[PDB]
Amino acid sequence: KHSCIAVIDAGSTGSRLHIYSYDTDDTNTPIHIEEIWNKKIKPGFASIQPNSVTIDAYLTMLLADAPIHNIPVYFYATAGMRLLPQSQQKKYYDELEYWFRQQSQWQLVEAKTITGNDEALFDWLAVNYKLDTLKSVQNKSVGVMDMGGASVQIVFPMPKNAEISKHNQVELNIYGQNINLYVHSFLGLGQTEMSHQFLNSPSCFANDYPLPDGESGQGNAPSCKEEVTSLMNSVHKVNQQIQPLLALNPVNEWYSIGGISNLASSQLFHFENSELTNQSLLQQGDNQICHQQWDILNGQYPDDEYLYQYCLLSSYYYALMVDGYGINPNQTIHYIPPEQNLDWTIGVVLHRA
Numbered sequence: 001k002h003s004c005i006a007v008i009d010a011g012s013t014g015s016r017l018h019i020y021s022y023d024t025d026d027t028n029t030p031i032h033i034e035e036i037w038n039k040k041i042k043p044g045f046a047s048i049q050p051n052s053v054t055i056d057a058y059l060t061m062l063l064a065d066a067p068i069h070n071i072p073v074y075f076y077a078t079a080g081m082r083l084l085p086q087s088q089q090k091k092y093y094d095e096l097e098y099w100f101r102q103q104s105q106w107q108l109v110e111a112k113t114i115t116g117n118d119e120a121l122f123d124w125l126a127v128n129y130k131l132d133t134l135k136s137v138q139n140k141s142v143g144v145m146d147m148g149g150a151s152v153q154i155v156f157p158m159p160k161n162a163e164i165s166k167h168n169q170v171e172l173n174i175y176g177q178n179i180n181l182y183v184h185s186f187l188g189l190g191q192t193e194m195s196h197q198f199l200n201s202p203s204c205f206a207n208d209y210p211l212p213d214g215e216s217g218q219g220n221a222p223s224c225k226e227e228v229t230s231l232m233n234s235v236h237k238v239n240q241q242i243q244p245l246l247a248l249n250p251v252n253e254w255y256s257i258g259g260i261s262n263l264a265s266s267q268l269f270h271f272e273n274s275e276l277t278n279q280s281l282l283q284q285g286d287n288q289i290c291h292q293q294w295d296i297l298n299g300q301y302p303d304d305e306y307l308y309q310y311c312l313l314s315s316y317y318y319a320l321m322v323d324g325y326g327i328n329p330n331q332t333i334h335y336i337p338p339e340q341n342l343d344w345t346i347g348v349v350l351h352r353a
Contacts, residue, residue: 003023003024004019006018006068006072007020014043015041016038016041017063020036021034022353030350035343036067047080055092073109076111077114079149082150082187083187093112115167116184116186116187117183117185120185122348123144123257125174126343126346127255127336135175137177142253143246144255145321147191148258149190150188153184154185155183157180159180164245186238189232191259191316199211199212201227202217203223203227204312204315205294205311206292206294207290208295220291221286232320242325243324246326246327253332256333263310275333277331277332278321282318290315
């Protein structure tokens with residue numbers, strides 16, 4: 001009845017296969033995109049031994065039960081593979097290429113580690129497809145932030161600029177309209193990776209939270225924020241790279257995908273309309289977690305295994321958006337509810353199907 005395409009997201013913690021059906025409109029653009037099958041496997045591809053037996057077992061577990069036959073597949077690895085040496089990446093792709101050559105059910109189009117800039121493009125397309133803002137010329141500038149586990153991405157409209165790296169600019173035409181986007185990714189600034197630098201920082205944890213080194217949490221969101229900002233601006237140069245461009249290319253609406261919704265959904269936070277402001281986020285984290293006695297808090301919410309990190313995470317999100325990107329603390333940030341199942345792989349269908 002329809003066209004179909006498979007996209008494998010080979011992420012840091014696991015790989016997820018998505019199979020989509022779609023139609024194509026008179027602009028040569030996919031419409032009515034629907035996920036018809038999903039499969040997730042652990043652990044991350046970049047964590048398994050890159051030999052034939054291990055790769056065969058892994059790809060077989062991921063793909064064997066798919067209800068499809070003879071479908072194009074894109075295998076796109078993200079930050080987890082980007083953190084591996086390149087010579088090491090090649091071992092995986094040589095095995096994977098051979099595996100797909102031995103079978104007929106899957107027509108491998110591309111298998112590669114995509115850049116964070118590529119990921120940012122797909123993030124923007126996925127979100128804008130969900131918001132139904134692609135089929136018409138908008139006039140409002142929509143920006144997307146992905147708060148990932150290992151990298152973070154930011155993407156917003158910006159006219160082509162010869163003084164900016166080609167790698168941070170994308171041109172595409174969707175539903176008949178030319179789009180120019182600025183894209184950027186910060187590898188290592190994702191919440192899981194960055195957190196590994198802050199675990200013994202007492203300003204980043206609830207009072208009396210037991211830090212790995214034996215010291216006690218003594219939370220203070222502004223202090224935690226300042227420490228996170230140093231990583232962002234001195235190592236990653238976030239503000240120096242992003243803030244001037246955003247100044248000159250103002251975004252009217254911001255949407256975030258990734259980890260914010262998990263935090264914003266906690267019973268300790270109060271956000272409405274699936275949105276927040278950074279000012280409110282930092283205040284709530286500071287009051288409810290950073291300056292809160294840990295044993296009491298944990299006793300009241302014993303099932304929430306991520307709550308202990310919420311002083312750090314609220315501080316970190318503020319550091320990234322306000323001190324890094326230069327977003328006003330009172331600007332509304334929409335976040336995509338986790339129940340919505342919005343996935344960046346939709347952007348692959350839009351761009352490449």
